[PDB]
């Protein structure tokens, strides 16, 4: 595993691999912050959609009610001489329907957010799964060098200098 002959050369490489390890280990930790924050944000969006769904459900309960109640009301009071409040009742209901589109559209905008974020989340997870094998090998290489030098009796002072 060690590709060098003399202490000083081996020690110089130990420094490179440890510096490479620490830089990579930092890149992973940086991506892990992004990754987890994104899960949190996704979970938030996912419940916000549930809140939209459940709000739209409540709006559709109104629509059912006005339809039924309007019909029943009109029949009890005949629609005969009194027809002034029908155009009102119907115009109010146009506003009700019109508000539901706005809300339906917002849910649609959030869903498109969630979709863009979900694809970023997967790209973060792809990036870290390609880092992982490098991080592991650099750790294992670093240790092999520390071993090699320790077996040869190289002093801790020189090793500490090479690990800085």
């Amino acid at each position: 595993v060690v590709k060098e002959d003399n202490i000083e050369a081996v020690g110089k490489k130990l420094h490179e691999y440890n510096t490479q390890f620490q830089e990579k280990s930092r890149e992973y930790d940086r991506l892990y912050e992004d990754y987890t924050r994104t899960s949190q944000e996704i979970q938030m969006k996912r419940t916000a959609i549930e809140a939209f769904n459940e709000t739209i459900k409540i709006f559709e309960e109104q629509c059912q009610t006005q339809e039924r109640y309007s019909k029943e009301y009109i029949e009890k009071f005949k629609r005969e001489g009194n027809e002034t409040e029908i155009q009102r009742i119907m115009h109010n209901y146009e506003k009700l329907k019109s508000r539901i589109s706005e809300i339906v559209d917002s849910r649609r905008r959030l869903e498109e957010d969630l979709k863009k974020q979900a694809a970023e989340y997967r790209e973060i997870d792809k990036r870290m799964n390609s880092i992982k094998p490098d991080l592991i090998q650099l750790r294992k290489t670093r240790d092999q060098y520390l071993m090699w030098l320790t077996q040869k009796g190289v002093r801790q002072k020189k090793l500490n200098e090479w690990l800085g």
Partner: protein
């Protein structure tokens, strides 16, 4: 924008829409709604305002009935501003509770329902009934019982100013140390005694000396104040087919899903059966399929063990690797048997957790949770089929059928060796020869070495069913062990539910005070329980429902990890059941969370403004936010999370400041005219750091302080409160009359302690300094706390040293070295009180350090057992047996008392050299 356009849905189907103020309350909104309604259709068919009640959708995405119309619209915080009127009459009792629980635990209760999981469903049925049941028995009991529940006695391990309730004027009487609460109320039985401005009552058969308040009055040097309380005032608060299957265990590995691996590499799924930590048999491995997002193996993975040889807590554990023709991608574990005891069958989708890079990197992760990955949409998963073993299904055998094996089915030389073998060192590892010794004299272990149960369990061959029956036969007739021995049995090393049951039975003798000392550890043990409905959870709920301090802190321990997917479900379900059995306390906890919500929001403003503005002006900019109607009422008049007995009444906005340093902690000051002369509480809100290690450390220092007091050494410690409340969020208790060594030190340190308490009380302050230094020098040495310097040690005006900001411990430090004992030369001077060669004082100080340390060795195993259990918590600095080995070495447990005491003396003197 200060006002919000709100959608109003009338019950006729009519729709109104107009602006209201964000700070307007629902009662006012309804007046404005009616006024507008007049001029819309169908108004005459409506009943009056009071016949109706608003409905909205929560932040948690659930319908909420807004019964309390005094709440502001901004405080209700509806998802979109949509209010819908419904009939005021409508079985509101369960409706309004469920709403509050959801908003209090943070997770919506609908999210449990949506799982369509019978285990979850059963739990919610059984426990919510049990907790209700308990609650009813609470209300059924009288005034004495409820007072005991509500505010338990705060007890230790001159005059008295009593007064009648509802009076400004008082009468200053006089009483000495030892006197009973009945004897107090003489100078009666209908009443109780209450500390002024705090929810803390003196009652029972204990003497006055043993109460914390009366003791706390002496060392400060002040007169107490108590108050008589009539039962009316108390009740007012109260009112308001067997293992014949010799077939080898096999599993079908069908396909994966949603795998985000590298295309050039190749995928493999390794797997293995486990009983806790130990392997039941060797690990099998899949064929190297090419990297797909939807891989397909289709292999029968047969193991080196039979179905009849599977133990109750058998656990198959999976790991998906990626190899260049190695990268751990993800892992997921399964229990073979289920929660109703049936051996599982059919297909099962295993939603996997992502693999964290360890320093080691084991094959699988058997310690990891059985709980599934909630992120089902995005998470990778593995489709597998557990086959049909018999034409009708099978359960694990019942205790009566297990006892049947032991039912029908001794050398002096053997005996003497076992006495040696089982009496020796801490643990390490016994040989297979000696394991058979322990298995052979296994009844003699039960007869003469009851406390060696843990070792016998370890030596048991859990991959052989005949041994499992023989062990469990002995365990059923096993004698009750101590608390110390029982805490060991709670560790992940002993997964079998019979051990867990036996453990809890031995733990039931715990007093509430003692149970409180281990609660943090007990909560972490939940994390590695297999099933939801378990004896530990039932234990914790039973005790939480009987003691409101236990319940309070149980609430927050769980609440503060609700953001963690692996525990969210489990802890959510417990909090729900706790809430149902504690409807009164639910309201107190709500006002706290609402405070905490505001403090985060306030801390965000300090975080934004600190990056632009300077420090003095930003303090005033914080106040302007705090003076507001919403921010004042939400922060005012609440029980402290750090101590529910403390009443944080009026915020002192002028006194409130912050530290422009790192995570910009907010210093919130409180005042109240009930408490006393020293009656001002403070709390540090802190968002960005993780406070759990800080909390463990302080709690461990508390335990040291208790252990010393029992053996008769008061080392004047300051165990200030620290409570994680959320995701990198918590409170720290402010210690008044205090400053950092750095600020005093910027020859100087001696002059500060002189000024505060000069003349006669200076010698007492030296005795305070020397006593606390002893304690905190041992504590930090044993626990291995490093990075100790000027700006993270504080001194109190009384004299007492105490430590702060415990970043690291157990020798861990930079990105891991044994911490030397530390006598600081500055601190040595203060002990020697100015003089150079003051052997009189410094020998007595060293005499105390030797004593302190010695007492801690005697309860060494306690610290090992508690720290063992905390491996569950996933703190980076406490994650293995080596982190525990630090304490074994620091407490010197493997050496004799003489050997440890000299070892400590050497380390002391090694410090005394490095001082100079």
């Amino acid at each position: 924008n200060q006002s919000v356009v709100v959608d109003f849905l009338l019950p006729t189907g009519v729709y109104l829409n107009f602006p209201v103020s964000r700070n307007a309350n629902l009662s006012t909104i309804k007046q404005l709604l009616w006024h507008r309604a007049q001029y819309e259709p169908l108004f005459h068919m409506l009943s009056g305002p009071e016949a109706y009640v608003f409905t909205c959708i929560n932040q948690t995405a659930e319908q909420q009935e807004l019964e309390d119309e005094q709440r502001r619209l901004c405080d209700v915080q509806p998802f979109l501003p949509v209010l819908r009127l419904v009939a005021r009459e409508g079985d509101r009792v369960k409706k309004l509770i469920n709403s509050q629980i959801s908003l209090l635990i943070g997770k919506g209760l609908h999210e449990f329902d949506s799982l369509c999981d019978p285990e979850v469903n059963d739990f919610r049925a059984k426990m919510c009934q049990f907790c209700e049941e308990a609650a009813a028995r609470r209300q059924q009991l009288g005034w004495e019982a409820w007072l005991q529940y509500s505010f338990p006695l705060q007890l230790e391990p001159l005059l008295v100013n009593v007064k009648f309730e509802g009076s400004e004027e008082s009468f200053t009487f006089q009483v000495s140390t030892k006197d009973v609460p009945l004897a107090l109320m003489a100078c009666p039985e209908d009443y109780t005694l209450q500390v002024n401005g705090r929810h803390e009552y003196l009652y029972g058969s204990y003497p006055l000396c043993q109460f914390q308040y009366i003791c706390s009055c002496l060392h400060s040097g002040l007169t107490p104040h108590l108050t008589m309380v009539h039962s009316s005032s108390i009740l007012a608060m109260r009112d308001e087919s067997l293992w014949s299957l010799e077939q080898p265990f096999r599993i079908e590995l069908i396909q994966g899903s949603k795998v985000n691996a590298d295309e050039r590499m190749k995928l493999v799924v390794q797997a293995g059966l486990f009983h806790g930590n130990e392997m039941l048999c060797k690990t099998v491995s899949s064929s190297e399929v090419s990297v797909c997002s939807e891989p397909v193996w289709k292999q029968r993975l047969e193991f080196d063990i039979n179905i009849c040889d599977l133990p109750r807590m058998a656990r198959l554990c999976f790991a998906l690797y990626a190899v260049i023709e190695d990268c751990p991608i993800a892992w997921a574990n399964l229990m073979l048997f289920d929660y109703k005891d049936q051996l599982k069958t059919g297909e099962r989708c295993l939603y996997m957790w992502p693999s964290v890079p360890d320093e080691k990197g084991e094959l699988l992760n058997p310690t990891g949770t059985v709980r599934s990955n909630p992120n089902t949409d995005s998470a990778a998963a593995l489709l597998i089929c557990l086959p049909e073993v018999a034409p009708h299904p099978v359960y694990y055998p019942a205790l009566e059928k297990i006892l049947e094996l032991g039912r029908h089915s001794v050398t002096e030389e053997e005996q003497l060796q076992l006495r040696e073998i089982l009496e020796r060192r801490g643990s390490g590892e016994l040989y297979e020869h000696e394991k058979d010794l322990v298995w052979k004299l296994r009844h003699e272990v039960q007869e003469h070495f009851p406390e060696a149960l843990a070792r016998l369990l370890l030596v048991t061959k859990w991959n052989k069913h005949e041994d499992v029956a023989q062990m469990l036969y002995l365990l059923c007739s096993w004698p009750e062990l101590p608390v110390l021995s029982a805490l060991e049995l709670l560790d992940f090393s002993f997964p079998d539910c019979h051990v867990g049951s036996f453990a809890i039975k031995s733990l039931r003798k715990l007093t509430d005070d003692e149970l409180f000392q281990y609660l943090l550890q007990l909560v972490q043990v939940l994390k590695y329980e297999s099933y939801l409905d378990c004896e530990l959870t039932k234990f914790l709920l039973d005790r939480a429902l009987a003691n409101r301090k236990i319940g309070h802190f149980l609430f927050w321990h769980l609440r503060s990890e609700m953001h963690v997917p692996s525990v969210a479900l489990r802890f959510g379900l417990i909090l729900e059941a706790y809430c149902r059995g504690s409807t009164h306390h639910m309201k107190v906890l709500m006002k706290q969370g609402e405070a905490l919500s505001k403090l985060k929001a306030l801390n965000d403003f300090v975080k934004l403004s600190s990056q632009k503005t300077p420090k003095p002006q930003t303090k005033e900019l914080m106040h302007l936010c705090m003076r507001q109607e919403a921010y004042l009422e939400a922060l005012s008049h609440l029980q402290s999370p750090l101590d529910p007995s403390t009443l944080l009444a009026e915020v002192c906005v002028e006194q409130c400041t912050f530290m422009d340093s790192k995570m910009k902690p907010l210093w919130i000051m409180y005042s109240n005219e009930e408490a006393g002369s020293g009656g001002s509480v403070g709390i540090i809100f802190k968002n960005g750091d993780d406070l759990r290690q800080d909390m463990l450390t302080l709690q461990m220092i508390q335990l040291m302080d208790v252990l010393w007091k029992q053996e008769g050494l008061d080392l004047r410690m300051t165990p200030y409160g620290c409570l994680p409340t959320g995701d990198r969020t918590g409170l720290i208790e402010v210690v008044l009359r205090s400053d950092t060594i750095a600020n005093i030190q910027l020859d100087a340190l001696l002059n500060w302690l002189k000024s505060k308490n000069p003349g006669e009380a200076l010698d007492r302050a030296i005795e305070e300094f020397t006593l606390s230094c002893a304690g905190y020098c041992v504590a930090t040495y044993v626990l291995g706390i490093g990075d100790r310097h000027s700006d993270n040690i504080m001194i109190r005006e009384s004299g007492q040293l105490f430590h702060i900001d415990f970043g690291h411990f157990l020798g861990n430090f930079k990105t891991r070295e044994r911490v030397p004992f530390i006598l600081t030369y500055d601190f040595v001077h203060v002990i020697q009180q100015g003089k150079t060669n003051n052997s009189e004082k410094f020998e007595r100080f060293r005499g105390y350090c030797e004593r302190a340390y010695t007492i801690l060795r005697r309860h060494g195993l306690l610290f090992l057992h508690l720290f063992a259990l905390m491996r569950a918590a996933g703190l980076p600095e406490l994650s293995c047996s080596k982190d525990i080995q630090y304490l074994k070495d620091s407490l010197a447990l493997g050496k004799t008392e003489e050997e440890a005491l000299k070892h400590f003396r050497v380390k002391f003197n090694e410090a005394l050299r490095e001082s100079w």
